[PDB]
Design a protein around this ligand. Structure first.
Ligand code: MG
Ligand code: MG
Ligand code: ZN
Lengths: 63, 338, 103, 132, 220
RNA sequence: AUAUACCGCCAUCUUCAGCAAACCCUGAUGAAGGCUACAAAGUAAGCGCAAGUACCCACGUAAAGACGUUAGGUCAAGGUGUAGCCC
């Protein structure tokens, strides 16, 4: 079946790679929709890090 | 007497002593079936019963009770003894296994394809290889020192899709089954350049294990750590160099190898990222420029910076080898085909 | 008389397949690093030693300069260099015969 | 612990029939007696003779049909008639089954001086009630 | 069947907005439903910074301009999945809205799971339900956080099982593993009701359009 | 001769409720860990308890009572491994 490594790439990347490698016999129902209308950001896992130095959140105040 | 007789199974259970004080905690004989070579209607008197041990009809006529001659019965006994001896020899001999990295090691030993999936899924294209078999003990009050087996298993279809898993079990075969059935659900897809090698050199440090992989041309072979050789065979990589430094922990080595291989950047991705043709220069092909990658989107007309000096963190071993100062008596040793 | 006929034969295909004749050979040696030289010869005084090399273990394989299909298995297709003896496991005698036949 | 006529669960892999899966304290409750004769009733005699005959019949049919009996025999006595009902596998050829039926019936009838009959019910394999 | 499979399945993928979901909502409607309201600046999660318009008196405000595009993409994806007769599973551990969400699912012919999420409903579904069970083809989170403010385990499980997930992410949520995140308020009753109505309308429109297309092809 | 080779039949905690395969998840896929009901990763077939059954009820008494523990008892119920005796 599909790879369960949620922290490696996205679901689309893993599914496409497995289909190309022939592990997945048939593409899932959602694959064509994702290919046609991908989201703005690929859902790649990312570990959040807290800022430590001069870097600060760019969220400007509303005035 | 007769009523004191028992069944074969009960007698074997009593004689083999599979359970008891000695076998309870480990504070040689084996079962042999006596019915495999015995035919109904055969006795020491050598009688021929029509319909049970001999054909009911001979020459289209009903057979009668017949008794084999003494010489014929001797021949039958000799045939029975010969069959028993041949079966005993066949059972004693075995098809010798293919040893792994060493005769008594479990690494490199193939386990066959993983068990088929329930929903019509088969993994006959996948090969399973053992990488480490450790006996792990724990201190429990109830049982003293509890023993278990942890097995590291790598699987792969030889076409990029490969994975690894860890199986904990009280029984070694159960650990193998668990690990090899869990690995196929954790399959990385490793991109291979020209379906034989990695796309570029990979320098990684997973925990305390440094892995340095060098892309190599066709026919260079796998000059890598034996575990990396096995994993690359599972992936489908045929030419690569790999040096392991620091801790050589097998689990960390496998995890770092898979991390680096999965995180490698393909030529097409580089071309799309920087919007420039990725052109290959080969010494054997002379000055011919081979455009191995081209950007999907619009091409970048920026002639790119002609960096006079590249600020790249070199490795001292590579520079020493290139300059010839390295004189290790173990490098470039002739070895069997990998 | 016709060594290439063996490689054209069905028995060779069944025994070896598309793999080279040395694919399944594995030297038995001490340690993890094999000795840098193979055995001098697998046939000593017309007697065959244990674990003979791929050439010696199959009497129908003749190292003859006309047996080009067999000699191709001992030359790297990508670089054209003849594999050294430890690479394929052939003994020194058969390796010298292979080199002379290839030349 | 009670070790009498019980199958101990080890890995949930051992197949057991309905008879083996039930401990003795279930005889009156879930598995009737494998033999049915009036000897053990009140005021009836020859219980020991019937018991000895039943034991001999079981040990004789077990060896006459080696590896064929799927489960334990069922012995019924009606007057002087004796009926052995046996669940048998389909491994052996029907010719051998009929030969054994005739041989066993005649030999038992002449040995015990009673009209013995043998009814065989064939099953493809040993019926598994549960796994232990 | 190719003349059927192609014409019904592939044709809607040729249109930028086949189901015309962009008419179902507007930035004014989201503003009225208090979609733009977020948590305190202290509770802000790092990955939600790009979707935050700004902070108004230490209160984060969600950029409805990005919310419009994200919601358009999510509604289009949900409508396409429903049109393909996929299984849609709404998930929200917010008790206050639980009942309502369930009703919406029961009204849209889809499935809901608002109660406690037992360990392994997705990664062990072959054993919990059966070897032939069909996992959902799309999961919609009305709330991406459990009752202890950690991300819902269903997000990670669906990412493991390669199930695309639409999700309403507040300022303190983690949109990293969500396939189609919609930055919006998940606490106001108006916002949750608007999301439920929008997804219900998208799914119903998709199902009725699928019925219309199938009937039209049969009449061809 | 050996219960310190066993089957067989049992003692004992047991006047116990735990034993658990098979999966899933967490720890970077380290020896490990998996508890929250206004619930936060566990599910569990099966075994035992329970249930059901016997006796006079639904109560009670029996029966039942797993995995383990004492190298627990029995080679003298019987069978059997090993070893020994055969004027
Ligand atoms: Mg050895
Ligand atoms: Mg919120
Ligand atoms: Zn030789």
């Amino acid at each position: 079946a599909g790879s369960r490594l949620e922290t490696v790439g996205s679901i689309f990347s893993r599914t496409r790679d497995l289909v190309r490698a022939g592990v997945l016999k048939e593409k899932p129902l959602w694959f064509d929709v994702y290919d046609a209308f991908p989201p703005l950001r690929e859902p790649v896992f990312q570990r959040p890090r807290v800022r430590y130095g001069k870097a600060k959140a760019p969220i400007q105040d509303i005035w | 007497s007769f009523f004191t007789k028992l069944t074969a199974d009960e007698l074997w259970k009593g004689a083999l002593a599979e359970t008891g004080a000695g076998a309870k905690k480990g504070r040689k004989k084996k079962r042999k079936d006596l019915n495999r070579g015995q035919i109904i209607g055969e006795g020491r008197y050598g009688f021929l019963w029509p319909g049970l041990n001999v054909p009911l009809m001979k020459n289209g006529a009903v057979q009668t009770i017949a008794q084999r001659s003494k010489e014929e019965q001797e021949k039958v006994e000799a045939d029975m003894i010969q069959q028993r001896e041949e079966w005993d020899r066949k059972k004693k001999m075995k098809v010798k296994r293919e040893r792994g990295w060493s005769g008594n090691s479990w690494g490199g030993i193939s386990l066959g394809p993983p068990d088929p999936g329930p929903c019509g899924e088969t993994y006959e294209d996948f090969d399973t290889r053992i990488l480490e078999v450790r006996n792990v003990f724990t201190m429990t009050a109830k049982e003293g020192r509890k023993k278990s087996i942890r097995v590291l298993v790598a699987v792969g279809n030889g076409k990029g899709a490969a994975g690894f898993s860890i199986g904990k079990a009280t029984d070694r075969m159960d650990a193998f089954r668990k690990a090899k059935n869990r690995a196929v659900h954790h399959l990385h897809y490793i991109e291979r350049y020209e379906d034989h090698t990695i796309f570029h050199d990979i320098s990684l440090r997973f925990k305390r294990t440094h892995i340095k992989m060098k892309k190599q041309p066709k026919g260079y072979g796998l000059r890598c750590h034996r575990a990396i050789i096995t994993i690359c065979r599972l992936i489908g990589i045929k030419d690569m160099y790999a040096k392991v430094s620091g801790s050589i922990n097998m689990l960390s080595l496998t995890q770092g190898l898979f991390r680096g291989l999965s995180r490698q950047e393909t030529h097409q991705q580089l071309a799309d990222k920087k919007g420039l043709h990725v052109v290959e220069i080969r010494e054997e092909c002379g000055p011919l420029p081979i455009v191995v990658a081209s950007p999907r989107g619009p091409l970048r007309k920026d002639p790119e910076p002609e960096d006079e000096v590249p600020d790249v963190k070199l490795d001292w071993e590579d520079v020493k080898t290139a300059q010839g100062m390295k004189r290790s008596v173990w490098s470039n040793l002739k070895r069997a085909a990998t | 008389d016709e060594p290439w006929k063996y490689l054209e034969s069905e028995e060779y295909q069944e025994r070896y397949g598309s793999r080279p004749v040395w694919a399944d050979y594995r030297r038995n040696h001490k340690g993890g690093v094999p000795p840098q030289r193979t055995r001098k010869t697998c046939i000593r005084r017309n007697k065959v030693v244990g674990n003979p090399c791929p050439i010696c273990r199959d009497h129908k394989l003749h190292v003859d300069f006309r047996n080009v299909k067999l000699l191709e298995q001992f030359v790297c297709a990508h670089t054209g260099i003849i594999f050294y003896a430890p690479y394929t496991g052939v003994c020194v005698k058969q390796h010298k015969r292979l080199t002379q036949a290839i030349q | 612990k009670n070790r009498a006529a019980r199958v101990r669960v080890s890995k949930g892999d051992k197949p057991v029939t309905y008879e083996e899966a039930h401990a003795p304290h279930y005889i009156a409750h879930r598995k009737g007696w494998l033999s049915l004769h009036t000897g053990n009733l009140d005021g009836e005699d020859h219980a020991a003779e019937r018991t000895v005959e039943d034991v001999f019949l079981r040990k004789f049919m077990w060896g006459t049909f080696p590896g064929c009996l799927a489960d334990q025999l069922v012995l019924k006595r009606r007057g002087n008639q004796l009926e052995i009902c046996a669940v048998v596998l389909r491994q052996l050829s029907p010719h051998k089954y009929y030969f054994l039926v005739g041989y066993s019936e005649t030999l038992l009838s002449y040995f015990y001086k009673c009209p013995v009959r043998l009814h065989l019910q064939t099953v493809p394999s040993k019926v598994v009630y549960k796994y232990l | 069947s190719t003349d059927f499979n192609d014409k019904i399945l592939n044709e809607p993928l040729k249109h930028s907005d086949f189901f015309n979901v962009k008419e179902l909502f507007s930035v004014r409607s989201l503003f009225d439903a208090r979609v733009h309201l977020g948590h305190k600046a202290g509770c802000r999660h790092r990955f939600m910074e790009p979707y935050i318009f700004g902070s108004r008196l230490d209160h984060d405000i969600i950029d409805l301009e990005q919310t419009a595009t994200h919601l358009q993409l999510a509604l289009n994806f949900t409508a396409h999945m429903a049109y393909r007769k996929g299984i849609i599973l709404f998930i929200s551990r917010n008790r206050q809205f639980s009942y309502l969400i369930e009703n919406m699912a029961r009204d849209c012919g889809e499935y809901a799971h608002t109660r406690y999420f037992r360990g392994g409903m997705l990664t062990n579904a072959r054993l919990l339900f059966g070897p032939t069970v069909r996992l959902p083809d799309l999961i919609i989170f009305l709330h991406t956080l459990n009752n202890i403010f950690e991300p819902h385990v269903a997000v990670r499980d669906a990412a493991k099982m390669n199930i695309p997930t639409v999700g309403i992410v507040d300022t303190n949520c983690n949109p990293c593993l969500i396939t189609y995140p919609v930055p919006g308020n998940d606490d106001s009753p108006l916002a949750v009701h608007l999301y439920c109505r929008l997804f219900q309308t998208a799914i119903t429109r998709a199902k009725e359009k699928r019925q219309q297309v199938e009937a039209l092809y049969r009449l061809q």
